[PDB]
Amino acid sequence: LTGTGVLTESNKKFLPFQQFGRDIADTTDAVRDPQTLEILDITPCSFGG
Amino acid sequence: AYYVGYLQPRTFLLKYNENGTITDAVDCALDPLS
Ligand SMILES: *[C@@H]1O[C@H](CO)[C@@H](O[C@@H]2O[C@H](CO)[C@@H](O[C@@H]3O[C@H](CO)[C@@H](O)[C@H](O)[C@@H]3O)[C@H](O)[C@H]2NC(C)=O)[C@H](O)[C@H]1NC(C)=O
Ligand SMILES: *[C@@H]1O[C@H](CO)[C@@H](O[C@@H]2O[C@H](CO)[C@@H](O[C@@H]3O[C@H](CO)[C@@H](O)[C@H](O)[C@@H]3O)[C@H](O)[C@H]2NC(C)=O)[C@H](O)[C@H]1NC(C)=O
């Protein structure tokens, strides 16, 4: 699973077999680390007009 | 005692709760209301 963003700590529980999470419009919200049992949120990098 | 059944390709609607567990489902082919 690949992309770009800001990785931050998070407060989300998970089931031992789940790897990823999503928002409604098929958007990867969080990722679980393989090496350790941790959940990171992802936030878009700042942009604007 | 034991039982046996066969699966078929069908369309379901599933409900997820905050903790993320399945709690209900609906079968599109059952009846017109579903
Ligand atoms: C493979 O993955 C396991 C966990 O999935 C990794 O094990 C963890 O390794 C860390 C060290 O990098 C351990 O922390 C240290 O271990 C001692 C053991 O007495 C403990 O007192 C402290 O926790 C200390 O900080 C950690 O305990 C250990 N287990 C976990 C996190 O459950 C392992 O390093 C990975 N790699 C290999 C090659 O095994
Ligand atoms: C999703 O999971 C959370 C976390 O487990 C559920 O909230 C927790 O629900 C329990 C009741 O089952 C609340 O009481 C606690 O029960 C345990 C086990 O008996 C006990 O050790 C605690 O001292 C406490 O009495 C618990 O307070 C509550 N957690 C928080 C932070 O308020 C939640 O109900 C689940 N969502 C569902 C089932 O829809």
Side-chain angles (χ1 to χ4, degrees):
Chain A
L1 197 159
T2 71
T4 77
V6 179
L7 303 180
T8 76
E9 295 183 11
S10 71
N11 189 4
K12 294 290 187 69
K13 303 183 180 182
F14 76 107
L15 306 181
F17 61 97
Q18 292 163 338
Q19 307 293 26
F20 317 132
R22 274 180 162 85
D23 293 357
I24 298 176
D26 190 27
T27 300
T28 305
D29 183 60
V31 178
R32 191 178 70 91
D33 288 358
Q35 279 200 3
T36 65
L37 313 180
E38 199 63 346
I39 310 95
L40 303 183
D41 284 353
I42 306 193
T43 301
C45 302
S46 190
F47 81 93
Chain B
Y2 80 88
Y3 308 92
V4 183
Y6 304 105
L7 299 61
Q8 294 166 17
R10 294 197 177 215
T11 307
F12 285 175
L13 185 78
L14 295 88
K15 181 172 172 183
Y16 293 92
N17 61 353
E18 288 194 7
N19 297 21
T21 53
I22 297 164
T23 74
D24 204 349
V26 180
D27 182 0
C28 301
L30 185 70
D31 63 7
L33 193 66
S34 310

